[PDB]
């Protein structure tokens, strides 16, 4: 089973790219952790905001294919770390890869919300998408460490 | 008013520091945002974690002085961004600087918890210290931006 982050935006700040990678690199060969970046739509003066968001979401859903769709969304389940570890174990059972969907600054499209099999809230706060990527990688790493009975690695 | 993060640990990786100061630097000259690092106690083979923690806490509380003390702790208030902006408005009315206390992985001492005037939970998840520093700086920036009608949020 692979864990696939499907996220809007390319060219993250270098510190985000570095921190993100540092967690991603912890995952072993038997649990691939991968990133798909969806281009952010350009929002000019007369932009159709609803249409741009729908296109972002269409691309995200295309990338997720037949995977289990978990959205990152502020109204989702406020899982604690033991809970997230239990969900990671649960994700193994049906054989699918898992796509974790992170929206851009205007959030997830309606189609992405309708498609969500599960939804996960990291915080009550409105978080910026680059930081969300890092938080998802770290927290999934932490969950991996719990499911595999390894001490947490603080670099 | 100043915001002062009082945080255990002196070994942050450059990427964490960089992200942290990406937000720290955005605060305006009239609301300085500062960091004070407290050394982590050595957790050797026969060390009493309670004593190590008590010592971190004494140093954290000495750094905070007479400031309003807000602890970052998982049982704290799960503030949303609007509520965090409202808290920033409350802090401003107080007159005192604010110290935001961030423990290491073993947490905060009983004296620090007892000294907290408010406590703030960022997440149900067990977040690592470095990401707590970045999250505190960004979220408070966000809240500041709401209070001043700056476009960031």
According to the annotation, is B135 in a ligand binding site? no
Contacts of A15 in chain B (CB under 8 A): 14-16, 18-19, 22
3-state secondary structure string, B78-106?
CCCHHHHHHHHHHHHHHCCCEEEEECECC
Experimental method: X-ray
CATH 3.40.1280.10 fits B2-153, yes or no: yes
Distance CA A46, CA A90 (A): 45
Residue of B nearest to A125 (CA): B80
CA within 13 Å, CB half, A119: 13
According to the annotation, is B124 in a ligand binding site? yes
Question: Which residues of B have a CB under 8 Å from any CB of A?
Answer: 13-16, 18-19, 22, 78-81, 83-84, 105, 122-129, 131, 134-135, 138-139, 142, 153
Q: Please, are residues B116 and B69 in contact by the beta-carbon 8 Å criterion?
A: yes
Task: Give the long-range contacts of residues A14-21, CB within 8 A, separation 24 or more.
Answer: A14/B15, A14/B18, A15/B14, A15/B15, A15/B16, A15/B18, A15/B19, A15/B22, A16/A130, A16/A131, A16/A133, A16/A134, A16/B19, A18/B14, A18/B15, A19/A134, A19/B13, A19/B15, A19/B16, A19/B19, A20/A133, A20/A134, A20/A137
Q: Please, are residues B136 and B99 in contact by the beta-carbon 8 Å criterion?
A: no
Burial of A101 (0-12, 13-18, 19+ CB in 10 A): buried
Distance CA A125, CA A133 (A): 15
Q: Single out the residue of B84, B62, B54, B82 nearest to residue B72, CA to CA.
A: B84
CB-based contact A122 B126, cutoff 8 Å: no
Q: Single out the residue of A28, A39, A32 nearest to residue A6, CA to CA.
A: A39
Torsion over CA: B72, B76, B79, B83 (sign): negative
The angle at the Cα of A19, spanning B37 to A92, to the nearest 5 degrees, equals 120
CB-based contact B134 A138, cutoff 8 Å: no
May I ask the CATH architecture of the domain A2-155?
3-Layer(aba) Sandwich (3.40)
CB-based contact A84 B125, cutoff 8 Å: yes
Resolution to 1 decimal, in Å?
1.7
């Amino acid at each position: 089973m692979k864990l696939q982050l499907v996220a809007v935006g390319t060219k993250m700040p270098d510190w985000v790219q570095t921190g993100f990678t540092e967690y991603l690199r912890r995952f072993p060969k038997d649990m691939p952790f991968e990133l798909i970046e969806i281009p952010a739509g350009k929002r000019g003066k007369n932009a159709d905001i609803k249409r741009i968001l729908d296109k972002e979401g269409e691309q995200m859903l295309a990338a997720a294919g037949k995977n289990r769709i978990v959205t990152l969304d502020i109204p989702g389940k406020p899982w604690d770390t033991p809970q997230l570890a239990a969900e990671l174990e649960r994700w193994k059972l049906d054989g699918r890869d898992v796509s974790l969907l992170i929206g851009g600054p205007e959030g997830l499209s309606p189609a992405c919300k309708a498609a969500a099999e599960q939804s996960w809230s990291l915080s009550a706060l409105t978080l910026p998408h680059p930081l969300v990527r890092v938080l998802v990688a770290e927290s999934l790493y932490r969950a991996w460490s719990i499911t595999t009975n390894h001490p947490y690695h603080r670099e």
